[PDB]
Every structure is written in structure tokens, then in C-alpha cells.
Amino acid sequence: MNRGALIKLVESRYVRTDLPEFRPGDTVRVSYKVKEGNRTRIQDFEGIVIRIRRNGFNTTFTVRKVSYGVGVERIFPLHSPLIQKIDIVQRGRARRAKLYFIRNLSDREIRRKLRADRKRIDQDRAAERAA
RNA sequence: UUCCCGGGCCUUGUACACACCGCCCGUCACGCCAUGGGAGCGGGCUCUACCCGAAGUCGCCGGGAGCCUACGGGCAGGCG
Numbered sequence A: 001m002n003r004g005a006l007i008k009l010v011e012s013r014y015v016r017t018d019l020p021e022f023r024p025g026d027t028v029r030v031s032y033k034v035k036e037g038n039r040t041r042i043q044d045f046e047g048i049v050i051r052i053r054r055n056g057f058n059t060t061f062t063v064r065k066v067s068y069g070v071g072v073e074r075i076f077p078l079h080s081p082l083i084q085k086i087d088i089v090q091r092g093r094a095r096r097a098k099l100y101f102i103r104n105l106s107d108r109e110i111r112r113k114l115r116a117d118r119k120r121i122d123q124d125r126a127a128e129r130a131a
Numbered sequence B: 001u002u003c004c005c006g007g008g009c010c011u012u013g014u015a016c017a018c019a020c021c022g023c024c025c026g027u028c029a030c031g032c033c034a035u036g037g038g039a040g041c042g043g044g045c046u047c048u049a050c051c052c053g054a055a056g057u058c059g060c061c062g063g064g065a066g067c068c069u070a071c072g073g074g075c076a077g078g079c080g
Ligand SMILES: [Mg+2]
Pocket: A003, A004, A007
């Protein structure tokens, strides 16, 4: 037998391919289905992705934002059915896979360290030229 | 005629005149009031240095690159 293949097989039903590719450093908006009273609704969460742990179906990514004066980080499964959509709001250029150092940087300092990933922006406009 | 009791006259000192059986000082005990000091405790104002930093004006850039053109430009956008 092939244990890996069997696992991928169990997983194949839950895999998603409708979400856009993004990198650590990109700014991203995750529309997330969320439960309250007595309804479920979509809440957006928008921030820099500071990390993407890979493990195929199990890869997860972490997004950080400042909300009303307090730092928040959210961790999402990339294949979570609760994600309605992800919109790329900006491409940042990182030099590092994991950006935990931005937790201690000022807003000025961050903006200086994560400049616009001019290449991947142009690349983004190049597509988005449709038929 | 020094002394004691009483009185007369002159004088001198007096913070006494309820007139020396006068006046009056301080501690101590007691009650009341205001205050000082006192390990500290709470508050108000104020100065200094540095970190972060909204809005906004000003200044630079406006390109790997957007919109308007009125295109040697302007607006978005970025930096300070
Ligand atoms: Mg395995």
C-alpha cells in the first residue's frame, strides 16, 4: 500500500482550488463565514499574512492586523470551507518566509520593510486581461 | 519708742483702686478649638528627555505603474 496516497485520497474531497495564490508579506482579505445570533454571516478579516505553514491539505496561514489599537492574529486553514473568498488587497515583498518580526515594528517601520511587490502587482494586472 | 496692735502729718515706690484679705506667673490633672512637625497615603498643576503618532498644510517623488488631458501638465498613489 501507499499510506500517503491513501491520505491524499481521503483528503481529495475537501481540497479547494478556487482561492488565489498569496505569499507572506501580501495583504489579504479573508471573507469568513461566522456564527452568531441566530444567524451566520460573513466577516471580513484584512491584514498582512505573516506565515504560511505547508502540509498539503493541511496547510494553514496566519493573518495579522491592528484592530482598534490592539494587535490581532487569525489562523485559517487554507482549505477551510468557511472561507467564502480571499481577495488580494496588496502584494508585499518579504525576504523571509515567516514575518514574526513585524509584531514589534511600528507602522512606519513595517511599511518601510514590506514595500509593494511591484513585480507581482504587474503580474497581477497582466492577467485580469480577459476574453 | 527697737518690737507687736491702732492712728495722725510729710514724703517715696506701685503692674493695687474688690485697694495686700490686692494683683499675679508657670508646670501638672481635665474638657474644647486652631495650628506646626511626622514613616507616609491621595490628588492638582508644571518642566525635561526620548518612543509612537491622527487629521492637515507644506515639501520630494509620481517609476516595474493607474485615470484625465486641457500631455514639459494634472488627479490618484508613494515618501518625508
Ligand atoms: Mg503522510
